[model samples]
Target: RPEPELIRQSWRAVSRSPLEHGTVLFARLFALEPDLLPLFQYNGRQFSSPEDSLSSPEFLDHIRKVMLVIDAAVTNVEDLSSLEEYLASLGRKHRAVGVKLSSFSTVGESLLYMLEKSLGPAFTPATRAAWSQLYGAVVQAMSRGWD
Candidate 1:
C-alpha cells in the first residue's frame, strides 16, 4: 500500500534534522541488536567510540547515509521506482556483506520504533502504518534485487 499524506508530513516533521534523529535511531539500533555492530566494522564505520561515547565522525557519516536512504524512500514513496536501481544497489551492498532479507525487517522495525519516539504524540497509528507501508515496498524491491 502507498503511504498517506499524513505519514509523508509526519515523516517530514520527524526527520527535519537527519543528523539529530538519525543519531537517536542509531543508538536504538545498537540497543536492539548489539550483534549488528560488527557489520559496521567491515564498512569502516562505528557507532560509538571505545568509551561508549556519543559518536565518532565516521559514525556520524554512517548515520547521515542511513537517514538519506530513508529520506529517499520517503521522498520517492509515491514513485520509488525512479530509485529502483539505487535501492537494488543498496541491497547488493548488504548481500555482499552476507546480510539476510530478515535483517531488513529488523532495520525497518528499528526505524519505526525510532520514528515513534521521535514523532511522539504525532505518531498516530495511521502514520506508523504509512511508514511500514513505505518500508515494506522498499524492502520488497530491494529484496528482489538481492536475488
Candidate 2:
C-alpha cells in the first residue's frame, strides 16, 4: 500500500489545483451515482448543481476553512482522545443530515471510482485499499457519536 504520506500529499496536490476540489468531488460523485442528486434537493428546495455549488466562492472559502481545522486535528492522530473529540463534533453534524452509517460504504465506493478515474495509473490496489480502510475507520468512529 502507498504510505499515508503519499495519500496525504496527493490529496493536498489535488486540493491546491485551480480546480475546485469540492466541485470536482460533487461532479465526479454525481456522475457515478446520479441517484444521489435528489437527496440534495428534498423539501421543495432546488439544490444547486454540483458544478455551481462546488465552484461557488462561498463553498471554496468554507472548504479552505474546514480543511485547516481537519489538518490540525489530523496532526495529532496518534492521540485518540483528541481525535475523538473532533470527530464527535463532525459526526453529529453529519448525522443531522440523516447520513446513516451504512451509507458510508456507498459513498466510499463512489469516491474510489472517482479517484481511479481521475488519477488513472497513479491509483494502485494498495492506495485504494489503504483509503478504503481509512475511510471505513472514520465512518465507524463517527457512527459511535450517532449512537
Question: Highest lDDT, which number?
Answer: 1
Q: TM-score for all predictions?
A: 0.84, 0.66
- Candidate with the greatest TM-score versus the true structure: 1
Count of clashing pairs, candidate 1: 0
Model 2, poorest ten-residue lDDT window? 71-80
lDDT of 2 at 85: 67
lDDT of 2 by residue, 1-147 (tens): 325664565455445552444445556656766665545433456346765555456556645654454344334334434566667677787678665556656656765665676677887777777667655655666676685
**Residue pairs clashing, model 1:** none
lDDT of 1: 0.75
Q: Per-residue lDDT for 1-147 in model 1, tens only? A: 566576578778657888878767766776766666666652455545332434556556778888888888877877878887888888888898767778778788888888887779888888887788888888877886677
Q: Cα miss at 3, model 1 (Å)?
A: 3.4
